Amino acid sequence: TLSHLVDVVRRAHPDVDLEGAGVHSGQFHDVLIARDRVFRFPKTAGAAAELPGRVAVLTAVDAVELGVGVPVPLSEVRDGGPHGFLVLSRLHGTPLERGDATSPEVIDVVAAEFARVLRAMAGADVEKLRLVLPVADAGRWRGFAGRVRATLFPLMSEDGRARAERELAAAVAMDHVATGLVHGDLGGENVLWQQVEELPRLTGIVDWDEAKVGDPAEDLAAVGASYGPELVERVVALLGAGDLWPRIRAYQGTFALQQALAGAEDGDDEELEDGLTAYRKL
Ligand SMILES: Nc1ncnc2c1ncn2[C@@H]1O[C@H](COP(=O)(O)OP(=O)(O)OP(=O)(O)O)[C@@H](O)[C@H]1O
Numbered sequence: 001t002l003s004h005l006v007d008v009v010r011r012a013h014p015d016v017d018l019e020g021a022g023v024h025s026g027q028f029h030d031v032l033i034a035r036d037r038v039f040r041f042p043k044t045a046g047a048a049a050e051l052p053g054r055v056a057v058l059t060a061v062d063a064v065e066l067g068v069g070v071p072v073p074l075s076e077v078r079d080g081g082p083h084g085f086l087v088l089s090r091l092h093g094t095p096l097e098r099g100d101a102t103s104p105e106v107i108d109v110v111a112a113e114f115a116r117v118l119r120a121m122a123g124a125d126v127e128k129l130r131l132v133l134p135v136a137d138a139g140r141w142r143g144f145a146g147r148v149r150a151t152l153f154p155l156m157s158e159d160g161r162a163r164a165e166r167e168l169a170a171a172v173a174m175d176h177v178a179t180g181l182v183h184g185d186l187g188g189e190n191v192l193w194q195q196v197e198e199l200p201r202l203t204g205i206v207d208w209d210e211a212k213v214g215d216p217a218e219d220l221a222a223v224g225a226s227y228g229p230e231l232v233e234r235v236v237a238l239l240g241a242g243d244l245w246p247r248i249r250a251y252q253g254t255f256a257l258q259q260a261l262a263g264a265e266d267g268d269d270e271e272l273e274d275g276l277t278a279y280r281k282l
Pocket residue numbers: 024026031033038071072088089090091092190206207209
């Protein structure tokens with residue numbers, strides 16, 4: 001298909017260096033990752049419904065004014081190609097490695113980069129956001145607990161199951177919070193940094209697919225899991241978010257299970273395996 005798509009690209013946009021260009025033909029969409037541009041070509045006219053969803057989420061996130069880059073639609077959604085396509089800006093930068101982020105000369109700067117994005121997300125107009133993004137539903141964690149029990153419990157030791165029931169229950173115990181923007185995979189590989197005059201700057205965030213109106217604690221949990229307690233303590237102290245710790249820990253207690261349940265439900269053996277490692281024996 002992909003030498004069709006390429007002519008379509010050269011047809012729609014003459015100048016587009018396709019040597020060096022990466023390619024992900026995952027489940028629903030083919031993505032051409034070019035120099036300064038990304039092209040998403042859905043497979044099936046069903047999956048093409050996602051293109052205006054992605055425009056709507058990126059436009060809503062852009063309007064919050066986070067102070068960091070988010071992918072920009074460079075084109076309207078087009079009915080060209082097999083089922084349509086969307087061109088987005090490519091964001092430049094590299095994920096921050098744990099070791100790169102905790103050195104004593106950078107940790108305050110790194111904390112403040114996370115804090116200023118988290119602060120702007122917590123201060124978003126959620127009335128505007130609730131019209132476009134998904135919203136945290138009070139039933140989410142009961143839901144997740146059901147699927148963990150259905151799918152992973154039979155694979156666990158009895159001690160595994162008892163640990164998981166406690167972690168699931170701490171999540172189900174949390175009351176319902178929907179007061180800001182939540183990215184939902186913060187401190188992943190989709191958070192991009194650059195050296196700006198020899199110090200880290202958080203320049204871009206890609207992958208707004210899981211974004212919603214939700215709990216500010218959920219993104220803080222992910223920063224902690226990725227970068228360790230020293231860094232998340234600094235971000236929390238800057239945010240004045242000391243009251244969130246029990247919520248933060250409840251999110252974090254569900255991350256190994258989230259891994260495992262998505263490994264199964266999607267079909268990655270290494271994920272499914274590695275989640276469960278603490279819910280079995282050597
Ligand atoms: N506008 C962009 N700027 C920078 N990198 C981008 C951009 N769009 C896509 N990418 C990169 O190319 C990849 C294309 O895959 P896609 O966006 O479908 O994500 P995925 O990794 O499959 O999904 P997920 O991380 O949500 O499970 C992304 O993972 C990201 O690294």
